[PDB]
Backbone:
């Protein structure tokens, strides 16, 4: 379904996102979500408010391009502009961060819909179908794989997220995954030009990491260049300990074990902003801390 | 309802790894009654029982330093019960010269019991061989799988552009296994060599395939040589080990023709050429122990 070229691009990007213990940032919080978030620190869920907190993020020192490989965006954000009229879309394309687009059971028209984003500054997508049976599994999976196979046609690296929202977890995770990658091998996907955002099998980070790797190394091929875990609910310190642990786990791991965090990278930064554009530096620090912290968990050198 | 208990796994894995542990490979001493004959036929021998037994006695009794290039030797039913010219048992001769013994199960029917036998006789690992076809054989190999492991043994998953095919088949095969809840870690894989070319390519395509389908839980992948001349089976395995792709698993060899061709031709039936045979075999044995470690220099 591809030409050497198309692959070269897909792989070049997939790897370039996790290249050196680098991870992925979630700047795709839905319109409501962002409000539940900004709510915790009593700021209104207004376009501006969002554009602002985010302007902060993407304006940190150009050394951030070392802990982050790419930032996924929510449609709106992906067309928002910084105080200078510059597109949040090019501010990243500069430093060296790749822009992603939260696409989300939306198979129809997600072709020319992608081809758009790709040519707007996005290079990879992100689709999600929740899991916690036989007709679902095979579906979400064959669904994923379907979705994925398109992005390839539209120079987009697809991050597959067969998440299993909250050891018994292992068995499940393994099966789901085993279906998922099988599914992909059928639609003749290009694993090498893929990525995987699996949940983190949730116990001490050691164990939590153990079970997790065993599962992945039992199912996810060595052709997938990376496995950026999502933190979904883990406190900023736990998402780091576990990713770290996962990287120290004594199992084979033919693939970059990274992070694709949102809450684990913002919680502190966002709480330090609280809407007062006067705390810009404070926010950028709580974010620089988490960004670096997890860049270490990704190379298992964190402590 | 898991097929095994922490222990049972420990054993299965301990063996699977112990077979490929240090660039060590697997020997095919399972040639069928008919097969063996065709072989013995080239050297022009009669397909007796004895004739066979001796040739083999020669191999299995080679310099105890052979246990540095071979981790396991697969066997044909009859042989597992033959005795060297000293009444001693190959079953033990090989188990003493540090080499795990394998049994050919080639037939899904009432295999369990059949295995449980072998396991307690000195065997610890075994063998066995369009969308439809694939699924059947897939789910087939999965049964042969689960059963072996119920009985301490280790299933040697042996699955049958050749890339595209190899990948699909394999992708079905390992999926199949994940369903019957097999213990990949206590498994092994004898995939053919993704081939029609330089061992550089022949190896490339091959690895890409495997690393695209075979999990990192499978401790090893002992290729079969089926047809490659003794030198090609060595170059390719070597090449495969030098290929620049991730390879979370021991890439070994599970050869027959590639280890005997020369040795057998040096024996020709004359028990008087015992040393000559044991050399042509010692050469291939070591030669491929290097390809397994991609340390094989080919003058």
Residues:
């Amino acid at each position: 379904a591809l030409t050497q070229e198309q692959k070269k691009e897909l792989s070049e990007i997939a790897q370039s996102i996790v290249a050196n213990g680098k991870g992925i940032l979630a700047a795709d919080e839905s319109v409501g979500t962002m409000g539940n978030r900004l709510q915790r620190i009593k700021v209104e869920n207004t376009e501006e408010n969002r554009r602002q907190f985010r302007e902060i993020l993407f304006s940190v020192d150009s050394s951030i391009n070392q802990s982050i490989g790419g930032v996924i965006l929510f449609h709106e954000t992906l067309y928002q502009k910084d105080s200078q009229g510059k597109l949040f879309r090019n501010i990243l394309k500069e430093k060296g961060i790749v822009v992603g687009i939260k696409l989300d059971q939306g198979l129809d028209g997600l072709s020319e819909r992608c081809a758009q984003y790709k040519k707007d500054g996005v290079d990879f997508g992100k689709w999600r179908p929740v899991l916690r049976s036989s007709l679902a599994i095979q579906e979400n999976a064959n669904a994923l794989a379907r979705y994925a196979s398109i992005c390839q046609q539209n120079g987009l690296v697809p991050i597959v997220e067969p998440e299993v929202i909250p050891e018994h977890c292992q068995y499940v995770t393994e099966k789901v995954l085993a279906a998922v990658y099988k599914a992909l091998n059928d639609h003749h996907v290009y694993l090498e030009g893929t990525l995987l955002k699996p949940n983190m099998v949730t116990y001490t980070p050691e164990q939590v990491a153990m079970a997790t790797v065993t599962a992945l190394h039992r199912t996810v091929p060595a052709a997938v260049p990376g496995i950026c875990f999502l933190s979904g609910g883990m406190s900023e310190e736990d998402a780091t300990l576990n990713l770290n642990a996962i990287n120290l786990c004594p199992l084979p791991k033919p693939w970059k074990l990274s992070f694709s965090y949102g809450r684990a990278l913002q919680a502190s930064a966002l709480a330090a902003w609280g809407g007062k554009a006067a705390n810009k530096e404070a926010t950028q620090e709580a974010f620089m801390k988490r960004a670096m912290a997890n860049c270490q968990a990704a190379k298992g050198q964190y402590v």
The two ends of chain B are 54 Å apart (CA to CA). Strands of chain B lie at 25-29, 70-75, 100-104, 125-127, 156-157, 188-189, 254-255. The first helix of chain B runs from residue 6 to 20. The first strand of chain B starts at residue 25 and ends at 29.
